Symmetry: C5
Subunit: 312 residues, 5 copies
C-alpha cells in the first residue's frame, strides 16, 4: 500500500445551479507519495512540466489515477507539475476547474443551508492508501460578507474512508476496499438582498389587493384585485431567475402558491359584497367587507407562521 498525502487548495466555489444541483470549484491539488529513489541532476530535485509529464511515464515512471468521484464531465486541468525528488518521493501539483454534483435541499430558500462536497478515489488502485487530507479554504469569508453570495462557515470537513464495492472482478477477498477523500465545505446563503428585492415587493402588491376591503364600488374593486394578480405574476416573472425551482415543494413556493389563493379568495369576497347589494341584502355585505378587512391579514399571518412551523 503506497501512502499518498493529498492537500487540496480551494480558491472559488461559484455558480450554484438550482436545477442540476451543480457548482464550479477552482483551486489546486497536491499529491505527495513516496515512490522509488532516482537520480536528479546533482542534489536539487527535478521539476517536470505538463508536456514532459507523459514522456516520463513512457520511460517507466509511476503516476496514480486520482479521479474525482462527484465530477460532472472531465474537469479543466490547467498546468500540471511533477516534482521528482532524488530520495524517492514525488509531489504532483495541478490547477483544476470543474463541475461537482451533490444532493442539495432548497426547501428553505430565504435562509438556505448548503454543503459543497468534493470526493477523490484512485480510479485504478484499491490497495494504495490515502495518508492525510488537507483543505485550505483560505479565501476569507468575513472579508466581504455582503459581496460573497455564500457565507463560508468552517474551514471544511476532512473525512478519509474505505469505500467498499460489490460488483468487481474474480479476485476480491481484500480488493473491494478503495481509499476515498470526502471534503465537505459548509455555507449559508445571505438573505440580505433577497428580502428588499423579492419578498418585500411581492408582499406590497398582495396588500394593495386588500384595499378593496374598504371600497364600496365593485367596478373599482375588480380593477384592484384583478390587476394586482397581473402585477404578482409579472413580478414573479422578473424574480423567477433568482428563485430556485426544484421537483419538491418549498417554503417560498408554498407562500407563492398561498398568495395565488389570497387573490382568488379576495375576488370571491368582492363578488359576494356585490351580489348581496344586488339582491337587496347590503347589511350582510357591509359586515362581510369589514370581516375580511381584519380576517385576511390575520389568516395570512397565521398560515405564514403555520408554514414556518412546519419547515422549521
Amino acid at each position: 500500500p503506497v501512502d499518498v498525502s493529498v492537500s487540496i487548495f480551494i480558491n472559488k466555489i461559484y455558480g450554484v445551479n438550482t436545477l442540476e444541483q451543480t457548482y464550479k470549484v477552482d483551486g489546486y491539488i497536491v499529491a505527495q507519495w513516496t515512490g522509488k529513489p532516482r537520480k536528479t541532476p546533482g542534489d536539487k530535485p527535478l521539476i517536470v512540466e505538463n508536456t514532459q509529464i507523459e514522456r516520463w511515464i513512457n520511460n517507466g515512471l509511476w503516476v496514480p489515477a486520482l479521479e474525482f468521484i462527484n465530477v460532472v464531465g472531465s474537469p479543466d486541468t490547467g498546468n500540471k507539475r511533477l516534482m521528482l525528488f532524488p530520495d524517492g518521493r514525488v509531489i504532483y501539483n495541478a490547477r483544476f476547474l470543474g463541475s461537482f454534483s451533490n444532493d442539495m435541499d432548497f426547501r428553505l430558500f430565504p435562509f438556505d443551508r448548503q454543503q459543497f462536497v468534493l470526493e477523490l478515489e484512485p480510479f485504478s488502485y484499491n490497495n494504495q492508501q490515502l495518508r492525510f487530507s488537507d483543505i485550505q479554504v483560505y479565501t476569507e469569508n468575513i472579508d466581504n460578507e455582503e459581496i460573497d453570495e455564500w457565507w463560508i462557515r468552517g474551514k471544511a470537513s476532512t473525512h478519509i474512508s474505505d469505500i467498499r464495492y460489490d460488483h468487481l472482478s474474480s479476485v476480491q477477498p481484500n480488493q473491494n476496499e478503495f481509499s476515498r477523500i470526502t471534503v465537505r465545505i459548509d455555507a449559508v446563503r445571505n438573505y440580505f438582498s433577497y428580502i428588499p428585492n423579492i419578498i418585500l415587493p411581492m408582499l406590497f402588491i398582495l396588500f394593495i389587493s386588500w384595499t378593496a376591503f374598504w371600497s364600496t364600488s365593485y367596478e373599482a374593486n375588480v380593477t384592484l384585485v384583478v390587476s394586482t394578480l397581473i402585477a404578482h405574476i409579472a413580478f414573479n416573472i422578473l424574480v423567477e431567475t433568482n428563485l430556485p425551482k426544484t421537483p419538491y415543494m418549498t417554503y417560498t413556493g408554498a407562500i407563492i402558491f398561498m398568495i395565488y389563493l389570497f387573490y382568488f379568495v379576495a375576488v370571491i369576497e368582492v363578488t359576494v359584497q356585490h351580489y348581496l347589494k344586488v339582491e337587496s341584502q347590503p347589511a350582510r355585505a357591509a359586515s362581510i367587507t369589514r370581516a375580511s378587512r381584519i380576517a385576511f391579514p390575520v389568516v395570512f399571518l397565521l398560515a405564514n407562521i403555520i408554514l414556518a412551523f412546519l419547515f422549521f
Copy 2:
C-alpha cells in the same frame, strides 16, 4: 467469436430535453473479454492507464471498438483503464458522460411515463459476441423521492440482441449480424410540485373570469374577463420553460387551448347579457347569466373528463 462481459454502472440520468428528446447519462463501463495469454511482472496483473493504453495498441494489443448507437455527439470519456491479466483476459474500465437520444412521449405531461434507453454495439466487429449485460442503477430512488425529478422504477431492463444490417460490404453471408446491448431504465415524473405551481394557479385565474356570471355591470364584467385572459397569457409565459413543447397535441396543451376558448366564450356571454339589456330584453339576459353561472363550470368539468377519457 470473442466473448465480452459488459457491466455498465449508472450514476446520474439528468437534464431531460423536451424538444430534442435527449438526456445526459453518467457512470462507468466495464468490458471483460478473454484475450490471449501474456506475461505480467510476476504473478500480479498489469494496470495500464489512459495515456499508456494507446502505447499498448501500437505494440500489438487488441482493443475492441465498443460505440454507443444512440449517443448524440462524442461522449466524454474521463479516465480509462486496461487491466491485462497473465492468464489472458482483459478488463476495461472507463468513466463516461454523454447525451443519449430515445423516442419520448410527452402527450400526458402531468403524469409522465418515460423510458431511458442505452445501446452498445461494436463499431467494427460482428462475429464478436457480447456475453452478458449488467446494469447497476444502485443510485437509490426511494431515498429522496421528492428531491429526485424522476422516480426510478425497476433496476433497468437487460436485453441482448443480434441486429441485422442490409447495406454492407461484398462478403455478408453471415457478417450482417452484430451483437447489441439494449439497456432500458424506466421512470415516472413526480407531479408533486407541478400541481400547486402550474395547474392550480392556471385554474384560479380562469374561475376569476367566471365571477362576471353574477355581476350585472358590463363595465366591471369586461375588466374581469379581459384582464384574466392577460393574467392567463402572463402566467403561461412564466410556466413555458417547465411546460414540454412538442410538434404533437398534448393533454396539457389541449386543456391550455380549451382555457383560451372558455375566455372567448365568456366574453360572448358578457356581451350578449349587455346587448339584450340594451335592446329592452333583460328577461333573457337575466336567465342567460344564471345559465352560464352553472353551465360553464359543468361544461369545463365534462370536457376535462372527455380529454382525460381520450388520453387515458
Copy 3:
C-alpha cells in the same frame, strides 16, 4: 482517377434554426475506394481503428481528404474505421454529427416547405472521381408522423456533379474540376400543433376586441380594444420562440402586422362612436358601430384571402 463509392446513412436531422438557416445531422459515412494490393494476416481483411488509422498513413497508406462543403464549423467525427482488404480496396466507416447550412425559405411558416442539403467534395483531390452516391434515410417517417417535427418525404435526392472552380493555382488546364456529391432530403413541417397553440388563440383575442361593435359605453369599449392589444403583444411574446424570424416579409408576419392595424382601426371606430354622441349626432354613431360590426370581420377575411392569394 481513383473511383470512390460513397454511401451516407442518415439517422437524425434535428434542431432547425430559423435565423442562421442551420440544422444538425447525424449518421455514418462509407467510402469504398480501390487502392493497391496489400498483405493482410492470412486471407481475412485487416480491421483498423481511429487511433491506429494515423499510424498507417505514416507508413505509406493513402487516405483521401473528403470534407463537407456546407458544414458549419468542424463536425464531430466519433469513431472512424479503415478496412484494408488483401485484394486492394479500402472501406472507410465514420460516425458524424455536425451543423449544415442551406438557403431556407420560411415565407410560409404554417405550411412550411424545406430542403435539407448535404455536400461532399474531396478537399485536396480533383482528378479523383466519386463513383456512386447512396442515401439511406431508413429512419421511418410514417412510423410517428405526430412525434416527428418534419414529415420526411422521399428517400432523398442523389446528385453527382463536377464543380468547376475559377480562382486556383498556376496549373489548371484540367485541375479545376472536382467531383461533388449533392444529397438533398425533402420535408414538410406539421401544422398539427401550430394552429391550436399559435394561430387559433391569436385570433380569439382579436375578435374579443370586436365585441365593442355592440357596446354603447365608451369607458367599457376602451377597456376592450386597449387590453386585447396588450394580450396580443403578450401572446406574441409567449409564441416568439416558435415563430421564425427572418430579414424578409412572411405570411405569418403579414397577418401579425395586419392584426396590429385592426386594433388601431377599431380604436378609431370606438373614438368616432364617442365624439359623434358627444357632438349630439348619435344617429351616425349608431350606424357607424353597426357598419364595423359586419365590415371588420368581412375586411379581415378578404385581406387574409388576399395575402394567401399572393403567397400561394
Copy 4:
C-alpha cells in the same frame, strides 16, 4: 524577403453581435509562397494533408505563422492542405471559421451602414513581404436580397500596408515593419422587415394614446394613456432582441425615449383637462384638449425631423 501570394475566399458573414461588435466569417485561405526546390514522386507535385503537415515541419519544412490580427479567440481551422511543388513554391489551403472584431456604428439602425474587416499579419516574420491580396466574395448578393440580412455592396476592399511597431526587441533599425493584409467588405442592412414589424406597430400604440384628445371622460382617458404605455413597454420587450443596444445614444433609442415622454406629457394633458373641469373652468379644458389634438402630432413630427436632421 519571402514573397507570399494570399488569396482569401469568402463564403459566409453571419451572426452580427450588436454588443461585442463581433461577426462569424467562413471561407478558405490560400498562401502561395516560393520556397526551396524539393523532389516530389515523379513530376507531379506532392499533396500533404493536415495530420502529415506537422510531420514535414519536423523534417525541416518551412511553414509561416500567418495569424489574423482582428480574430476573437483561436479560429476553427477545418482541413489544412500543403501542396509541395518540385520547382520550389508551396500552396497552403485551409478552411476557417472564426469570430472577428471591428468598430461598429449602430447609431442609425433602421438604415444601418456597416463594414466587415479582416486583417492578416505574419505573427513571427516582418522582413517577409505579402505579395498580393485577393478577396473572392462570390456569394451572390442580388441573388436573394430579401433572404440575405445584409446587402453585400462591392467585391470587398483590397489593402496591403506595412504596419510599424514601437515596443519590440533590441534589434529594430528595420525590423519594426510587418506586412499586413486589410480586407474590408461593405454591407447595408435591409429595412424591408424592420418597418412593418418594429417601427409601424410601435407608432400605432402611441397614436391610440392620442385618442384621449377627443374623449371628455377622464375615467376612459386614464385607461387609454396608462394602458398604451403598458403596451409600448410590452412591445419593446418583444422587439428588444431585434433592437441593437450599445453604450451610446441611437436614432432608434432617441425616438424610443421621446415616445416615453409623449405618454407622460399626454398623462399631464388628460389630468389638466380633468382638474380644470373640477375647478369649474371647463372653457380652458375644452381648448386645452383641442390644442393637444393638433399640437401632439405636429410636435412629434417636428422632433422626429429634428432627430433625423441631427443623425443625417
Copy 5:
C-alpha cells in the same frame, strides 16, 4: 534567480459579468529571459513556432511555467513563438484570450468605478525573479468615448511583488517567496445612455401614478396607481439584463425598492381619500390629497438625496 522581462500588450477588455465578477481580456504576452548561449543558423536568431516549441523542450530547452493566478479556466493561447538568440536570451511571444476574476463593487451602478486586474506568477519557480512589468494599453480611450463601454483611465498600474505562501514542501524555508506581476487597469462606466434608457423612463411611470393627487374619482385613481405599478414591473423586466444584480444592496436597488413603496403608499392615500368621502368626512380627504400632492415629490427628493448622501 533567472531574470525574466515581462511585457503584456492589452487589446480588448470586453464582456463584464455582473454576477460572476468576470471579464474577457485579449492581447499578447512577451517573456524575455537570459538563457544559455546556443548556435543559430549563421548570425540571425532562430524563429520557432507553436508546433515546434514542444520539440525543443524534449531536446533540452528550458521553458518556464508562467500561469495567470486570476484566470478562470484554461485561457485560449492562439499562436505561441519562441525566439532563440545565439547570445543566450530567449523571447517568448504568445496571443491570449481568457476570463479573469477580480472583486467588483457594483454598489453605485449609474456612476460605476471598476478595476480590471491581471496577475502572473510562475507555477513552478519561486527563486526565478520577474525583472520588469510593462502594460501597453495603447487601444485609444478618448478616440471613441461614446462607442467604448468603459472609459480607460490611466495607462494601467505596474506592480511587482513577492507573494509569500504557507502550505508548501520540505525543501526550503526560503522557497515560499514567488515573484508576481500585478497589472491593474482602471475604468469608469459611461452613464451617457443609462439615464435616457433606464433612469428617466422609470421615473416618468412613477410620476404618472402621482396624477391621482388631483383626481377626485376613486375608480379613475385605482386605474392610475395600480397600472403604473404594472408598467414599473414591466419596465424593470425590459431593463433587468442591463441592471447589475449582486448579493449586496445597491444605490439603484435601493431606489428601485423605494419606488415599490411609493406605489404602495400612494395606493393607501387614494384608498384613504375614498373611505373619508364614504364616511361623510371629505374635509380631511380634500386636504389629504392636496398634502400628498406636494409631500410625495418632496419626500422622494429628500430620500433620494439621503441615499446619495450615504453611498457618496
